[PDB]
Design an enzyme around this catalytic site. Structure first.
Site, PDB file in Angstrom:
ATOM      1  CG  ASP A  50      -1.603   1.238   1.493  1.00 27.16           C
ATOM      2  OD1 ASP A  50      -2.395   1.681   0.638  1.00 27.16           O
ATOM      3  OD2 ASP A  50      -1.333   1.832   2.561  1.00 27.16           O
ATOM      4  CG  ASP A  52      -1.990   7.592   0.794  1.00 24.71           C
ATOM      5  OD1 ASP A  52      -1.086   8.432   0.571  1.00 24.71           O
ATOM      6  OD2 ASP A  52      -2.970   7.428   0.037  1.00 24.71           O
ATOM      7  CG  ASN A 152      -9.920   0.040  12.345  1.00 24.48           C
ATOM      8  OD1 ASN A 152      -9.522   0.035  13.516  1.00 24.48           O
ATOM      9  ND2 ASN A 152     -10.273  -1.056  11.701  1.00 24.48           N
ATOM     10  CB  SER A 249      -3.755   7.180  -3.882  1.00 22.70           C
ATOM     11  OG  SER A 249      -2.654   6.286  -4.017  1.00 22.70           O
ATOM     12  CG  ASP A 349      -1.796   2.176   6.473  1.00 23.15           C
ATOM     13  OD1 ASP A 349      -2.776   2.847   6.885  1.00 23.15           O
ATOM     14  OD2 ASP A 349      -1.515   2.038   5.257  1.00 23.15           O
ATOM     15  CE  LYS A 360     -13.056 -13.626   8.488  1.00 23.67           C
ATOM     16  NZ  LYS A 360     -13.999 -13.002   9.459  1.00 23.67           N
ATOM     17  NE  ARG A 440      -9.833 -14.088  14.007  1.00 18.35           N
ATOM     18  CZ  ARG A 440     -10.733 -14.992  14.378  1.00 18.35           C
ATOM     19  NH1 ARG A 440     -10.985 -15.225  15.663  1.00 18.35           N
ATOM     20  NH2 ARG A 440     -11.385 -15.668  13.444  1.00 18.35           N
TER      21      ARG A 440
END
Ligand SMILES: [Mg+2]
Length: 472
Positions: A50, A52, A152, A249, A349, A360, A440
């Site tokens: 990623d 940003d 978050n 972005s 992040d 998942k 997790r």
């Protein structure tokens, strides 16, 4: 000293690639890579990023303050009271991962089960007995995503503080009347939920229609952390495997920020020809729309790199040198790089959009960047003394009316060393929702992805075998 100050002071350091300088360096906590589940680095075939707050870590509190000020001005320009302009961002209040309850207007720090660790209405901390009047079981359903919003990401720090500013303002401005679910002003009623929606929309608007991007790229030295060791890490990865970018972005902002982060008078190391940032990636993909990216995604498009507009139509061709993708899905990476989920270490992040959903839904290996961890480590060592004595006191229990009060005062003492909302990961003895989701879903985590540089690329990150209680 902020968390970003510690990372820029690490960023100013050049690479001493002497292999004991690395082994010594990597064993200081600030530069270590921590392991939740074991990972054989030699089985990684694709390193993905990623941008940003992963490759591009914005300087704190300068960046949060900018977004906060731009958001407030947006709210005032659509009709909120002029008094909002007197607000000023305060980095010692917000902690990441708090939950805003749009029903009662509270910011909540909760554990993995929705238990209330902290409840603040505006700036006034509601203590246990009073919290029961609104939370009878001192618990929320943190899945009820229509009532509750989890703040978050680091982009949410300004609105975290702003929501507490607004609630405190309307509560005490005498032209408003406090109600259980909002504020009355004669014939107009503003619920906490619509208030919340205006803030959310303002933050979106500032980011996509306002001047935030512009003011940032105007003064990248003031707002973005730069590290000469980034080109070096990416070039080492490109030898042992493939490197790719998958970011939400758009291309134009991506290009402006990426260009800045490679703006050195050298390439991977001092003495080497500078290279364009694009040359460091086998695959570049913007407008990713994570986490949707990890399910069905969107139609795969091709960026017109000279214009920054998308080319008309769906791209059906092969991976090609120089091509830049927009949209698609996780399987696009897998197809074009010829990889399977566990060949892919994705570095990001966002605990939800980057880490949880890729783990998942696709089985990808995960590396989570936590910029605050530089500071959090500094505090957790400096004041761990009172945590061991906190921990010793929970068994000091065992088989005593003051004991349940010294625990409450020690916990509050520990919490305030991090800020008014406490540590990212803890309130005293109790782990946050955030701490739990890190353990997790983040196979690896670190204060910065650059900490990988200090490990060989055959390294086996090992975590302890987990045992159930009955297995002891
Ligand atoms: Mg990010």
């Amino acid at each position: 000293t902020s968390w970003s100050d510690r990372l820029q002071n690490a960023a100013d350091m050049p690479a001493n690639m002497d292999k004991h300088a690395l082994k010594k360096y990597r064993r200081e906590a600030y530069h270590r890579v921590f392991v939740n589940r074991s990972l054989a680095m030699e089985k990684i075939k694709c390193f993905g990023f990623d941008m940003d707050y992963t490759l591009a870590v914005y300087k704190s509190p300068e960046y949060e303050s900018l977004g906060f000020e731009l958001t407030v001005e947006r709210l005032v320009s659509i009709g909120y009271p002029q008094e909002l302009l007197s607000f000023a961002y305060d980095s010692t209040f917000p902690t990441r991962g708090l939950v805003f309850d749009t029903l009662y207007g509270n910011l909540l720090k909760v554990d993995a089960y929705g238990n209330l660790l902290v409840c603040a209405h505006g700036f006034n901390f509601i203590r246990g007995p009073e919290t029961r009047e609104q939370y009878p079981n001192k618990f929320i359903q943190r899945d009820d995503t229509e009532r509750f919003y989890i703040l978050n990401t680091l982009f949410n720090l300004p609105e975290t503080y702003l929501l507490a500013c607004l609630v405190d303002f309307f509560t005490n401005c005498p032209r408003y009347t406090s109600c259980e679910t909002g504020f009355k002003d004669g014939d107009l009623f503003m619920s906490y939920r619509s208030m919340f929606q205006d803030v959310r929309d303002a933050v979106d608007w500032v980011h996509y229609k306002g001047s935030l991007k512009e003011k940032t790229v105007e003064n990248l030295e003031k707002y973005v952390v730069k590290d000469g060791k980034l080109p070096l890490l990416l070039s080492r990865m490109k030898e042992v495997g493939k490197v790719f970018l998958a970011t939400n972005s758009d291309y134009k902002y991506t290009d402006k920020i990426m260009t800045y982060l490679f703006d050195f008078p050298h390439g991977p190391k001092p003495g080497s020809s500078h290279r364009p940032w694009q040359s460091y990636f086998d695959l570049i993909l913007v407008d990713a729309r994570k986490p949707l990216f990890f399910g069905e995604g969107t139609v795969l498009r091709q960026v017109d790199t000279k214009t920054g507009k998308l080319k008309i139509g769906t791209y059906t061709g092969p991976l090609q040198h120089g091509i830049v993708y927009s949209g698609g899905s996780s399987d696009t990476i897998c197809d074009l790089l010829g990889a399977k989920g566990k060949d892919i270490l994705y570095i990001g992040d966002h605990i939800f959009g980057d880490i949880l959903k890729s783990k998942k839904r696709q089985g990808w290996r995960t590396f989570l960047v936590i910029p605050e961890l530089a500071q959090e480590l500094h505090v957790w060592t400096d004041k761990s003394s009172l945590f061991e004595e906190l921990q010793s006191l929970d068994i000091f229990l065992a088989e005593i009316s003051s004991i349940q009060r010294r625990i409450k005062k020690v916990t509050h003492d520990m919490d305030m060393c991090y800020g008014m909302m406490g540590s990212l990961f803890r309130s005293g003895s109790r782990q946050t929702l955030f701490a739990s989701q890190v353990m997790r879903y983040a196979d690896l985590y670190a204060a910065s992805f650059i900490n990988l540089l200090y490990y060989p690329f055959s390294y086996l990150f090992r975590a302890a075998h987990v045992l159930m209680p009955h297995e002891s």
